[PDB]
Write a protein that binds this ligand. Structure first.
Ligand SMILES: Nc1ncnc2c1ncn2[C@@H]1O[C@H](COP(=O)(O)OS(=O)(=O)O)[C@@H](O)[C@H]1O
Ligand code: SF4
Length: 214
């Protein structure tokens, strides 16, 4: 394939974690681009849930035409797809609509309707984890917008590491960022934001598995 060897990937992740200690998001993205850029012709990808365009704006500022994957499980909001289209049309980013092999009606007919209500782990595996893994096969590193304030279990989220689920380098530039940080960035850069985030939505994901404000 077109992915670096697993020991090489681990040594690169360790070197990046040790070298990017206390670096800004732009510095981490520049390191990722300089390491996995050549040999479009990009060898790293960015993942965005279309809740905002902060990570997308940063990745486009450090690499015009950077690929950005979006996991379209089929249960998304109309506002989420609208935000995806807006980010694609506005920013200099090549988006990828990663879809599962089975549609919503196909899965409802094969394994029963509303799999999220009966077995949510299998639904998330079939529609999110498996397509993400099938897409990441080929990229030596992938960038995520995970922040250490998202959950108490994410407090020790590392800057650069080796994801053992897909076996490749995982880099989180927005890890050290807080709510005030992302607010100030959205204000100073005028980045697109999902309309549901403006309406008081804590998180943005699949419609049946998203905590409603009310
Ligand atoms: N549907 C998705 N499509 C693409 N990337 C996603 C998606 N969901 C999560 N991610 C990636 O993981 C990060 C979000 O992690 P979480 O805090 O756990 O929020 S959540 O939407 O996935 O539940 C995003 O920044 C993104 O890089
Ligand atoms: S969030 Fe819910 S609907 Fe979306 S893939 Fe996971 S279980 Fe299925």
């Amino acid at each position: 394939t077109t992915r670096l060897t697993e020991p090489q990937l681990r040594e690169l992740a360790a070197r990046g974690a040790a070298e990017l200690d206390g670096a800004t998001a732009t510095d981490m993205l520049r390191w990722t681009d300089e390491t996995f850029g050549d040999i479009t012709t990009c060898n790293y990808v960015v993942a965005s849930n279309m809740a905002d365009a902060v990570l997308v704006d940063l990745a486009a500022k450090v690499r015009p035409g950077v690929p950005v994957i979006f996991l379209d499980t089929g249960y998304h909001f109309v506002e989420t797809i609208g935000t995806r289209d807006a980010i694609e049309s506005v920013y200099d980013v090549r988006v990828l609509n990663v879809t599962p092999e089975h549609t919503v009606a196909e899965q409802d007919e094969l394994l029963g309707k509303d799999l999220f209500a009966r077995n949510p782990h299998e639904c998330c595996r079939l529609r999110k984890v498996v397509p993400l893994g099938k897409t990441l096969r080929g990229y030596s590193a992938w960038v995520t917008g995970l922040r250490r304030v998202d959950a108490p279990t994410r407090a020790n989220a590392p800057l650069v590491s080796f994801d053992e689920t897909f076996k490749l380098v995982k880099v989180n530039p927005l890890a050290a960022w807080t709510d005030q940080d992302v607010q100030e960035y959205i204000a100073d850069n005028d980045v697109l934001v999902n309309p549901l985030v403006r309406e008081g939505y804590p998180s943005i994901g699949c419609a049946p598995c998203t905590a409603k404000p009310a």
